[PDB]
Design an enzyme around this catalytic site. Structure first.
Site, mmCIF file in Angstrom:
data_model
loop_
_atom_site.group_PDB
_atom_site.id
_atom_site.type_symbol
_atom_site.label_atom_id
_atom_site.label_comp_id
_atom_site.label_asym_id
_atom_site.label_seq_id
_atom_site.Cartn_x
_atom_site.Cartn_y
_atom_site.Cartn_z
ATOM 1 N N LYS B 32 0.833 -1.193 0.000
ATOM 2 C CA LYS B 32 0.000 0.000 0.000
ATOM 3 C C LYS B 32 0.869 1.245 0.000
ATOM 4 O O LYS B 32 1.757 1.396 0.844
ATOM 5 C CB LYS B 32 -0.939 0.063 1.212
ATOM 6 C CG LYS B 32 -1.919 1.256 1.167
ATOM 7 C CD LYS B 32 -2.892 1.296 2.353
ATOM 8 C CE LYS B 32 -2.282 1.707 3.683
ATOM 9 N NZ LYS B 32 -1.877 3.152 3.700
ATOM 10 N N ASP B 59 -3.475 4.228 -2.143
ATOM 11 C CA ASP B 59 -4.348 4.796 -1.120
ATOM 12 C C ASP B 59 -4.254 6.324 -1.047
ATOM 13 O O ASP B 59 -3.719 6.887 -0.079
ATOM 14 C CB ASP B 59 -3.919 4.120 0.197
ATOM 15 C CG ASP B 59 -4.700 4.572 1.413
ATOM 16 O OD1 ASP B 59 -5.854 5.032 1.287
ATOM 17 O OD2 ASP B 59 -4.133 4.426 2.527
ATOM 18 N N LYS B 61 -7.063 8.302 -1.542
ATOM 19 C CA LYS B 61 -8.387 8.764 -1.136
ATOM 20 C C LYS B 61 -8.828 10.025 -1.872
ATOM 21 O O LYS B 61 -9.128 11.063 -1.254
ATOM 22 C CB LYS B 61 -8.401 8.999 0.385
ATOM 23 C CG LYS B 61 -8.018 7.777 1.223
ATOM 24 C CD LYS B 61 -8.219 8.045 2.720
ATOM 25 C CE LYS B 61 -7.897 6.850 3.610
ATOM 26 N NZ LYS B 61 -6.472 6.439 3.585
ATOM 27 N N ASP B 64 -12.750 14.975 -4.902
ATOM 28 C CA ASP B 64 -12.807 16.229 -5.620
ATOM 29 C C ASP B 64 -14.037 16.224 -6.524
ATOM 30 O O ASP B 64 -14.882 15.332 -6.421
ATOM 31 C CB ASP B 64 -11.504 16.292 -6.429
ATOM 32 C CG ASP B 64 -11.054 17.701 -6.731
ATOM 33 O OD1 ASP B 64 -11.882 18.609 -6.982
ATOM 34 O OD2 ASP B 64 -9.819 17.879 -6.681
ATOM 35 N N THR B 119 -11.192 6.031 10.533
ATOM 36 C CA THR B 119 -11.110 5.474 11.894
ATOM 37 C C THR B 119 -10.908 6.526 12.983
ATOM 38 O O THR B 119 -11.291 6.330 14.142
ATOM 39 C CB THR B 119 -9.965 4.466 11.994
ATOM 40 O OG1 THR B 119 -10.173 3.411 11.048
ATOM 41 C CG2 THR B 119 -9.891 3.883 13.392
ATOM 42 N N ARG B 203 3.048 -1.426 10.650
ATOM 43 C CA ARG B 203 4.037 -1.579 11.730
ATOM 44 C C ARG B 203 4.381 -2.996 12.223
ATOM 45 O O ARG B 203 5.560 -3.295 12.421
ATOM 46 C CB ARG B 203 3.673 -0.626 12.865
ATOM 47 C CG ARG B 203 3.882 0.824 12.446
ATOM 48 C CD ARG B 203 3.299 1.801 13.414
ATOM 49 N NE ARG B 203 1.844 1.718 13.405
ATOM 50 C CZ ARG B 203 1.044 2.444 14.174
ATOM 51 N NH1 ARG B 203 1.549 3.297 15.060
ATOM 52 N NH2 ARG B 203 -0.270 2.295 14.079
HETATM 53 O O1 LIG Z 1 -16.242 25.563 -9.040
HETATM 54 C C1 LIG Z 1 -15.105 25.218 -9.440
HETATM 55 C C2 LIG Z 1 -14.630 25.679 -10.666
HETATM 56 C C3 LIG Z 1 -13.366 25.298 -11.095
HETATM 57 N N1 LIG Z 1 -12.621 24.475 -10.337
HETATM 58 C C4 LIG Z 1 -11.265 24.086 -10.750
HETATM 59 O O2 LIG Z 1 -10.483 25.284 -10.816
HETATM 60 C C5 LIG Z 1 -9.563 25.239 -11.913
HETATM 61 C C6 LIG Z 1 -9.875 26.345 -12.916
HETATM 62 O O3 LIG Z 1 -11.063 26.023 -13.640
HETATM 63 P P1 LIG Z 1 -11.396 26.655 -15.083
HETATM 64 O O4 LIG Z 1 -11.014 28.111 -14.953
HETATM 65 O O5 LIG Z 1 -10.539 25.901 -16.076
HETATM 66 O O6 LIG Z 1 -12.864 26.375 -15.274
HETATM 67 C C7 LIG Z 1 -9.715 23.842 -12.500
HETATM 68 O O7 LIG Z 1 -8.731 23.009 -11.883
HETATM 69 C C8 LIG Z 1 -11.125 23.431 -12.112
HETATM 70 O O8 LIG Z 1 -11.262 22.015 -12.024
HETATM 71 C C9 LIG Z 1 -13.112 24.026 -9.093
HETATM 72 O O9 LIG Z 1 -12.412 23.279 -8.373
HETATM 73 N N2 LIG Z 1 -14.342 24.399 -8.678
HETATM 74 O O1 LIG Z 2 -7.926 2.252 11.678
HETATM 75 C C1 LIG Z 2 -6.941 2.361 10.922
HETATM 76 C C2 LIG Z 2 -5.756 1.691 11.226
HETATM 77 C C3 LIG Z 2 -4.669 1.814 10.367
HETATM 78 N N1 LIG Z 2 -4.766 2.591 9.272
HETATM 79 C C4 LIG Z 2 -3.652 2.711 8.323
HETATM 80 O O2 LIG Z 2 -3.403 1.382 7.863
HETATM 81 C C5 LIG Z 2 -2.002 1.167 7.681
HETATM 82 C C6 LIG Z 2 -1.502 0.079 8.624
HETATM 83 O O3 LIG Z 2 -1.515 0.536 9.979
HETATM 84 P P1 LIG Z 2 -0.633 -0.178 11.118
HETATM 85 O O4 LIG Z 2 -0.835 -1.658 10.877
HETATM 86 O O5 LIG Z 2 0.787 0.314 10.922
HETATM 87 O O6 LIG Z 2 -1.245 0.278 12.424
HETATM 88 C C7 LIG Z 2 -1.336 2.505 7.941
HETATM 89 O O7 LIG Z 2 -1.153 3.202 6.696
HETATM 90 C C8 LIG Z 2 -2.319 3.220 8.851
HETATM 91 O O8 LIG Z 2 -2.189 4.636 8.777
HETATM 92 C C9 LIG Z 2 -5.982 3.248 8.979
HETATM 93 O O9 LIG Z 2 -6.084 3.952 7.953
HETATM 94 N N2 LIG Z 2 -7.035 3.126 9.812
#
Ligand SMILES: O=c1ccn([C@@H]2O[C@H](COP(=O)(O)O)[C@@H](O)[C@H]2O)c(=O)[nH]1
Ligand SMILES: O=c1ccn([C@@H]2O[C@H](COP(=O)(O)O)[C@@H](O)[C@H]2O)c(=O)[nH]1
Lengths: 224, 222
Positions: B32, B59, B61, B64, B119, B203
């Site tokens: 990961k 990972d 996440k 947007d 978590t 860990r």
């Molecule tokens: O409500 C908005 C409008 C634009 N953008 C972002 O802002 C940047 C400029 O957008 P634009 O001027 O090309 O439309 C781009 O990364 C676009 O995805 C947003 O995050 N939210």
């Molecule tokens: O509830 C949890 C526990 C661990 N982790 C993430 O999972 C991976 C393994 O964690 P650990 O086994 O080192 O505690 C790490 O990237 C840690 O940040 C989470 O996102 N949520």
């Protein structure tokens, strides 16, 4: 203090660099988001720094406090000018991120919070368990961001004045969704957003898709 | 036997991370790569892992607007990763768009997983971000939204696993962190039995003097 941050949303390194070569780094800052960072990584950001530009690393980190703070620290190691995180990650996550940047001093990146993405309308929020009106949720998250000790938030031009009134002149507002007069009266212009309280304007397509981007930026800067 | 453990690589230096990867075999685990190592070392680091024969769970996440989140997921597909995740809080449209952009990759697309409630979020934390529902109920809501958006599964705790399987099906993949080899923290065997499809462990393996032994003990207990 250039107010325009140009959005670099290219899926090709060559096109992105060809564009940046036409721009003077004293006339704007640049934004590197999830698309270009996932495709090209920190080396692309370094390529922009080598050219003299300051960068806004728009990765909207959102994770547990330990991880989000280490990602923000990584952004500081890269020497970026600004980095953001989701306010939805919570006060603890945001506070930890602001704390980890303290040792970087006056040169640390500005740490900004994302409230409610512009793509989220009431139906979208209800889907994720949020029953509050989007505008109220934005105020809730912006307030949480200020209370966590962050530097400001990303907000729409429409939200700017109200945020500036409740959170103060010093709390920075970064605003995307701006269009020069011409090209819809419902979309604010750069001048209208600055007047509303936006501290920085995030502009992409109007500049990146222009035949002469240096001219468009000059026109925008001159209008302010 | 397909490896169920995904080892978390949370290093702040590349030399240490690679020294570790050089001492474990890809037939015994997947890896990961999170926000820390990706922000520091980028896609080239993921490519090094691929060159070494490991499958990677990216990972990051993503959370947007749909256009951007989908282009980030597409970028993950371009990198050839085994799995990538997005926040379910980003909404059904963001998730659906991310799944739709992967269609041209066919079976080579990465598995696309949703993050529900981190978590680190207890009731006080959730109330702070405007969520008044009990964390357990909010997890089910978000996991259901993820399945309805067409995603492959979600990240969940070992405690949440059986209930998610009951409601969402055996085919909805569950990736579970917070596991410890062998009483409140479930063991790998307890989590797998509950429905976890993969176990994210960091860990206990990365800090071990004999990571291969730790992995064998974990694998043999399943
Ligand atoms: O409500 C908005 C409008 C634009 N953008 C972002 O802002 C940047 C400029 O957008 P634009 O001027 O090309 O439309 C781009 O990364 C676009 O995805 C947003 O995050 N939210
Ligand atoms: O509830 C949890 C526990 C661990 N982790 C993430 O999972 C991976 C393994 O964690 P650990 O086994 O080192 O505690 C790490 O990237 C840690 O940040 C989470 O996102 N949520």
């Amino acid at each position: 203090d250039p107010k325009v941050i140009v959005a670099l949303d290219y899926d090709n390194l060559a096109d992105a660099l060809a564009f940046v070569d036409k721009i003077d780094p004293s006339t704007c800052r640049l934004k590197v988001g999830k698309e270009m960072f996932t495709l090209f990584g920190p080396d692309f950001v370094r390529e922009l720094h080598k050219r003299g530009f300051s960068v806004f690393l728009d990765l909207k980190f959102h994770d547990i406090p330990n991880t989000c703070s280490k990602a923000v620290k990584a952004a500081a190691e890269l020497g970026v000018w600004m980095v953001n995180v989701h306010a939805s990650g919570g006060e603890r996550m945001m506070a930890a991120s602001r704390e980890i940047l303290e040792p970087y001093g006056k040169e640390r990146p500005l740490l900004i919070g994302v409230t409610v993405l512009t793509s989220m309308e009431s139906a979208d929020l209800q889907g994720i368990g949020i029953l509050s009106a989007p505008q109220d949720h934005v105020l809730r998250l912006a307030t949480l961001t200020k209370n966590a000790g962050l530097d400001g938030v990303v907000c729409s031009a429409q939200e700017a004045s109200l945020l500036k009134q409740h959170l103060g002149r010093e709390f920075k507002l970064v605003t995307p969704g701006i269009r020069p007069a011409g090209s819809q009266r419902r979309i604010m212009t750069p001048a209208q957003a600055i007047a509303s309280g936006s501290d920085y304007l995030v502009i992409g397509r109007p500049i990146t898709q222009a035949a002469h981007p240096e001219v468009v930026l000059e026109e925008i800067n001159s209008s302010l």
